[PDB]
Amino acid sequence: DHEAHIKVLRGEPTPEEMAALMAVLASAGGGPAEPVKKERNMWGHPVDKLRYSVFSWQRVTLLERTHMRR
Amino acid sequence: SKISKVLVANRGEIAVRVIRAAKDAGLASVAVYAEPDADAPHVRLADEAFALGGQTSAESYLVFEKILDAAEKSGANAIHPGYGFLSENADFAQAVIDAGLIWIGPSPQSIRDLGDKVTARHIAARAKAPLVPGTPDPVKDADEVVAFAKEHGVPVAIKAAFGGGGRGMKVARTLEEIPELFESATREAIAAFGRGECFVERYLDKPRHVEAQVIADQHGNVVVAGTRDCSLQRRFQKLVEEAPAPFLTDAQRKEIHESAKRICKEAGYYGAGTVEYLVGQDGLISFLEVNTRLQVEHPVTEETSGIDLVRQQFKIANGEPLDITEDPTPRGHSFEFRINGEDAGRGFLPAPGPVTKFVAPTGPGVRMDSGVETGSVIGGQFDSMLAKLIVTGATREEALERSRRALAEFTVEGLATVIPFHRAVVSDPAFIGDGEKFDVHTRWIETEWNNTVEPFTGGDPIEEEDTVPRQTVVVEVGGRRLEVSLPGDLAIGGGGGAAAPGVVRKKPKPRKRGGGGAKAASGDAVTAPMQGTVVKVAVEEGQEVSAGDLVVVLEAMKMENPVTAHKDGTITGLAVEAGAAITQGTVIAEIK
Amino acid sequence: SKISKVLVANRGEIAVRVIRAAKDAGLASVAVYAEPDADAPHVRLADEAFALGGQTSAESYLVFEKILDAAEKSGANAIHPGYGFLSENADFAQAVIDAGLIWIGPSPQSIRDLGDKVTARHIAARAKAPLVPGTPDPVKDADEVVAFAKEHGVPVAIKAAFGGGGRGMKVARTLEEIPELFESATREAIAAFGRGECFVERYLDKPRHVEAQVIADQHGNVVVAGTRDCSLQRRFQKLVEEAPAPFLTDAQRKEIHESAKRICKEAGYYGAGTVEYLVGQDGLISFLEVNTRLQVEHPVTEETSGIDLVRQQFKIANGEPLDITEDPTPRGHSFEFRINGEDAGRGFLPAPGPVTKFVAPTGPGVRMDSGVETGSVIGGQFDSMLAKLIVTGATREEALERSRRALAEFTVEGLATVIPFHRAVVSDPAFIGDGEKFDVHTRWIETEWNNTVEPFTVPRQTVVVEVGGRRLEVSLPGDLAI
């Protein structure tokens, strides 16, 4: 076991109060849910809108890397 | 003449204590400090402060020339030495007197005579003090030690005539040990103290340590202000002390109160002092020592007897007779707990570190004498003691109850302390006792106490789950105040964030070289394992050495650590000399 | 029967003091706090803590239902009220007893009897205590007040029979003022305390306030733990106090010691309490009051007599007989200095503010009882007292010397405090005294003292859950990110 658990550092709640606390915290916990994936869509990416000199090193380190990085 | 400005030739808690006594007396006060102490409370609390310079005791508080120069420049007219350093240096006492300053202490002759153990034995025998069966003079040879031990039985303690700090003794359980022990004793007494003289006495198996506070004036009056019991000792150094001494018959108690006065009168002693005794399991008292200084433990006597002992020192050094004509009657009971910067989870070894938090207990029956505060730093150069907690009550039971409270309130953070030990022992049946005796003794902490203190780790993340960020919030449920620690990744209900892309958790590696499965690499460098002072160099360049051979002794926190050759070879680059300050990882030498 | 868990129905310094006593006694302790105190030291020091809610004493610590609800929810079996608030409310004491809790205090009837200064005067007379000349019954009109002031001479005090806090007393210096003062006092007593009953007595010109600490047994034993002097006062409220009371003759230490026993024993009193007296410049003692609670000043008596008075309260409420069999001998001398947030440079006017630094003195002879620490915020909702510095020595002179030290060390920053006043008075010849008398008196601060002090220079979310049969409000920080 190496999950980081909730800790009650001070106080000793009765089981009813532990249940109220955990129910409220679990209702507050929200948003991401399961780890869905944002699908890759490079259409109209900002790096493609920039002017690069024909010999710009940013063609390698910015443009190409942005397209290739996965 | 009369004291008007006191220079406090010390540091830390005792310097604060004496500065406070001087303000109460209306005297001006001068602090002196080494460079590590440039921000210490006493430096800020005194009416003046003078920088001795230097980083270590040998080049600051031990230098006569510097302390007398600080007194001259400040125009101080008295010196109070505190305890340690020069407080028992008879030649410093003489130099202070020769400078025309008021020495707040016993005469140089009294210091010299009571500091010599065998002269002290003669003084106590002349005073008809209770002595443990033992040799009246230094023993000459292991054969004489064997003859003594054959007469008196076993075990026998062989002791250096000038030793201190618990290193002054060895004990022989079986006769055959005597020659090796005597060799070790004469060797190490020459090495540490410059004197080879050894004497032998009966070793007491489970003794209590009991001591009488004396106040003696220059007019020959003596008052015994009370007794302490100081049996909770570690490495023969005291950790918990209490007053009055509990569980003594009135016959024992009066014999202590009388022999202490006879001993002081025979010694010609004046000033504050203390007569130390041992009490055997048989109940026999035996004279042990006279300490020619104010004791560290003095405040439990102050709290029980109602006397300000530092101001009594000022009065005596003014040459006034004692206004106290009779031994005070103790009221209540008091404990002192030394707050040493020592980790009880590693055999009470001291370590330097930052005092990132210091919250003293307060309220009924609590007194705090501290030399540190939040933001202080403990370097490796001086004794580990941060502070003293004194807890007083109407009875030993009420003082224990208050001690359990106060020690639960006491918070120190950023370095290890013995507070977890004090929390244990004030709740341990061996020290609570049965109401007529108790089981603690001068070796109980090492050999009897159930040490369950977990080693100090501070805030370091050690396990995988420790690496996760956390938030602490206060929730009220039905009115109950709860403090709730929430992981920064809690996947409860719809919660998430268990991993941003590519985030991995694993057990962090300790900030130490290599794996713990080996001591060191095959490299040739001997490197210092800690900050400290090179106290001894045991080798010379071109010396051939073998693994385990001593290379240097490093003193840190006033404890010696031997640094030893990790391989065989030739010492090829000895880079340090005795007295050199040294940092962790410094190359001392290469072995080739 | 016996105390097992104590709820401390108070705040600040006294809440800390009682929590500490409970910890010493091995009892469990329950704190309660109003929202301004949600991080006060006592809330963290107690074994349990309950929010009362509310922003003021009347919304919180004074609400019987909130205190008894916290006791019910925490499972406390005793209540200790401290001082102030409900500590002398006989109806609350009764409500506690009816709730079946151990009330750590005197009986509701003893409270109600001694809280009426008229019935108190009767009990004192029947106990044959010294009494100042005065009417045995409330005065009906200014003409009765004038007749009294003619027959016994001016000045005369017109005093409310109910309430106090220093506002309950007005002084008529000459007969022409009496009608206005009488009517004004009547209307003000109606407004402030709901009852207009007032009485008249001789006003002492420069008295010393002296008081006896009593511990009294449910079995009718009584002990005087010591005399105390509280004559340094402003607005008739105490600022510096000391024990034992200095410069009394033995015939005045006796008489006080015996009157206090007689008064309490005839009132049927039990618990801790104080019989307050005035001592005139003629040296005549007069009974003044009984306070039916632990005194604010009590630490100076604990230091001089060696008794833990809160633990004595616990024993008496357990109904154990007193283990102290005789009046203790005072050992040394002790002072207490109240560290109020009042600016002595502006007529001791209270000012709220942040306690941006708080460094109590330490070392020999110093005790600090504190309700605040660094980072506390002081608002106007409660009394100004931050802490009490208690200083003790073998003699009065030594305790003064130690006080000059400790008060020079005492550092407080971010609001005004009376510390500069304490620093003056401990050096002031009027208080040091000539060695057989001193010149301070209960008006010596507002007059006669040289006031050379310079002037000072998101809501929580709530969710109402239900769990089985209980409503449970869960209160969260308003920005909980979770």
Ligand SMILES: Nc1ncnc2c1ncn2[C@@H]1O[C@H](COP(=O)(O)OP(=O)(O)OP(=O)(O)O)[C@@H](O)[C@H]1O
């Ligand atoms: N004969 C003995 N038998 C048992 N223990 C002993 C004996 N002599 C000394 N000890 C132990 O040694 C401790 C301290 O010894 P001692 O007082 O002689 O040295 P010290 O404190 O280092 O002296 P100094 O004042 O010279 O620095 C005693 O508390 C006791 O624990």
Ligand SMILES: Nc1ncnc2c1ncn2[C@@H]1O[C@H](COP(=O)(O)OP(=O)(O)OP(=O)(O)O)[C@@H](O)[C@H]1O
């Ligand atoms: N007859 C009197 N002559 C002079 N001063 C008096 C007299 N009666 C009361 N005082 C002054 O009133 C204050 C104490 O009065 P009292 O005991 O009625 O106070 P209170 O407002 O009821 O407060 P508490 O009950 O909290 O002590 C002190 O300043 C005392 O000097």
Ligand SMILES: *C(=O)CCCC[C@@H]1SC[C@@H]2NC(=O)N[C@@H]21
């Ligand atoms: C050293 O840093 C200063 C003095 C503190 C150590 C001394 S040694 C002798 C006394 N006994 C003790 O335990 N501490 C004192």
Ligand SMILES: [Mg+2]
């Ligand atoms: Mg010793």
Ligand SMILES: [Mg+2]
């Ligand atoms: Mg009053």
